[PDB]
From Swiss-Prot:
The chain holds residues 90 to 419 of 419 of the full protein. The gene is EAPA. The active site is at residues 35, 199. This is Endothiapepsin. Coiled coil: none annotated. Residues 17-328 form the Peptidase A1 domain. Its EC number is 3.4.23.22.
Length: 330
């Protein structure tokens, strides 16, 4: 089997991407944030505290003939941005782009933090990291991908995120028309439960490539590119007037600037992020200070190849017995 679903930016900045997901019988379609940095499939639901719902589409298990309470199971998750959610668990039929899993754990939110409430466009998350990170207790649950894997033509999924445009998540096949040149594969460590890999270096604009190992995670659920302070300083030093602002929470730059590209290494291959991808616009409406898309990972504890990086590539998440990651230009 295979699946193929379009993923669409939630706003004009590509802050996140939503992908329609069918849950239950008859289908209830919710728009979920596919997150390769976490491993819970959770949804706004008929159980979510009413004051914490503001425009989201909810899953109502009582209206699904295939829903079953997973008795005694609870979940609670906290994300790197400080947001959180928690609740109880149903199993139900879940389909993505024509690919169906029966008995998927669908984590129903009883509570969500303010950031989720305030984002009316995201109806929940679909985790695509390793199932060892799944938060369901006392019986840990598998991700949609883990459940689907044995049925897939090939044990892979691909992320093809657009810049200010829709893109695609495919399951079970590699669309050889969706990228240019060849795919370069690189080793993954699953020790922390993430799609963790080591980039071979970077360049700023037309500058020389610096060969240096940068361990980080491929995380579709993080907007920006978070890298070591040394690397980030080298980038922003090439932008007149750019500075790190503690009041704003990162690097800002004059909105009048033209940003240089940023290149990252994947083995001997190179992925180029155009300068425009690094512009996150005015810090507040009407400001002439713009927020940068490359930020320091210092104090996160991990480097994160978020959407800014991933959208510059066609990315293969290879979930074979020995997992790997592939990157191609597109």
């Amino acid at each position: 089997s295979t699946g193929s679903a379009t993923t669409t930016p939630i706003d004009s900045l590509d802050d996140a991407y939503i992908t329609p997901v069918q849950i239950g019988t008859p289908a209830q379609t919710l728009n979920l944030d596919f997150d390769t940095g976490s491993s819970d499939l959770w949804v706004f639901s008929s159980e979510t505290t009413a004051s914490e719902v503001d425009g989201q589409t909810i899953y109502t298990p009582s209206k699904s003939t295939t829903a079953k309470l997973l008795s005694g199971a609870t979940w609670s998750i906290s994300y790197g941005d400080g947001s959180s959610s928690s609740g109880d668990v149903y199993t139900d039929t879940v389909s993505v782009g024509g690919l169906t899993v029966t008995g998927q754990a669908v984590e129903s939110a009883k509570k969500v933090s303010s950031s989720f409430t305030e984002d009316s466009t995201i109806d929940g998350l679909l985790g695509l990291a390793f199932s060892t990170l799944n938060t369901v207790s006392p019986t840990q649950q598998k991700t949609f991908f883990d459940n689907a894997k044995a049925s897939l033509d090939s044990p892979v999924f691909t992320a093809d995120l657009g810049y200010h445009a829709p893109g695609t998540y495919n399951f079970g096949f590699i669309d050889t028309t969706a990228y240019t040149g060849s795919i370069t594969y690189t080793a993954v460590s699953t020790k922390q439960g993430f799609w963790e890999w080591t980039s071979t270096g970077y360049a700023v604009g037309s500058g020389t490539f610096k060969s240096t190992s940068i361990d980080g995670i491929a995380d579709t659920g993080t907007t920006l590119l978070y890298l070591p302070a040394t690397v980030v300083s080298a980038y922003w030093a090439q932008v007149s007037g750019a500075k790190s602002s503690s009041s704003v929470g990162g690097y800002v730059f004059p909105c009048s600037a033209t940003l240089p590209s940023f290149t990252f290494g994947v083995g001997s291959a190179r992925i180029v992020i155009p300068g425009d991808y690094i512009d996150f616009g005015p810090i507040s409406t009407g400001s002439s200070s713009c927020f940068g898309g490359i930020q320091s990972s210092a104090g996160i504890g991990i480097n994160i190849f978020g959407d800014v990086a991933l959208k510059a590539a066609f990315v293969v998440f290879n979930g074979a017995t020995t997992p790997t990651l592939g990157f191609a230009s597109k």
